[PDB]
Amino acid sequence: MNIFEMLRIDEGLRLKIYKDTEGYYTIGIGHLLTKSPSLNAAKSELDKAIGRNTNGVITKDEAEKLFNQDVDAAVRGILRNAKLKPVYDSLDAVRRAALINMVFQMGETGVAGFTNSLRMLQQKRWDEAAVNLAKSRWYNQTPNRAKRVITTFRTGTWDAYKNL
Numbered sequence: 001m002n003i004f005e006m007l008r009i010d011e012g013l014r015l016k017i018y019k020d021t022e023g024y025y026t027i028g029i030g031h032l033l034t035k036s037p038s039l040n041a042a043k044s045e046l047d048k049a050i051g052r053n054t055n056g057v058i059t060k061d062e063a064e065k066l067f068n069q070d071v072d073a074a075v076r077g078i079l080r081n082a083k084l085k086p087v088y089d090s091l092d093a094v095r096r097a098a099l100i101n102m103v104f105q106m107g108e109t110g111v112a113g114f115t116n117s118l119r120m121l122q123q124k125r126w127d128e129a130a131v132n133l134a135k136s137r138w139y140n141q142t143p144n145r146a147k148r149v150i151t152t153f154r155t156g157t158w159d160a161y162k163n164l
């Protein structure tokens, strides 16, 4: 298991524009196009991201290219952020994947807002971090995904993702 397999499980794969759990236009492996209500805006963003006239459909190769760029961007965002980088540096390789997962889903700014949870992770107070992380809109809106990420922080293993 690695970060790419992990996020492919959490996000799935869809080759036509769809709406994500918040109602926003998305494509591929959880690539957000726009928070605009306008399907035309979403198609225009898609064409710009892919570099051609897509009419809202992309190939699997194109989805995986956007996915590679998005994983790379999430990692680079962690390492440039003063609140995230020291947490990331303190963690083992499995728990690093959990942090990347959060940043992929809710952005660098959203995750840096989890001040108390980040402190607990940095101190390796895993059971306590897991409780604090669950006191969140994130957990209440996407509880099955949040539970898998939280279990990964708590245990340092991939068990939440095996048999999936």
Ligand SMILES: [Cl-]
Pocket: 141, 142, 143, 144, 145, 146
């Ligand atoms: Cl969920």
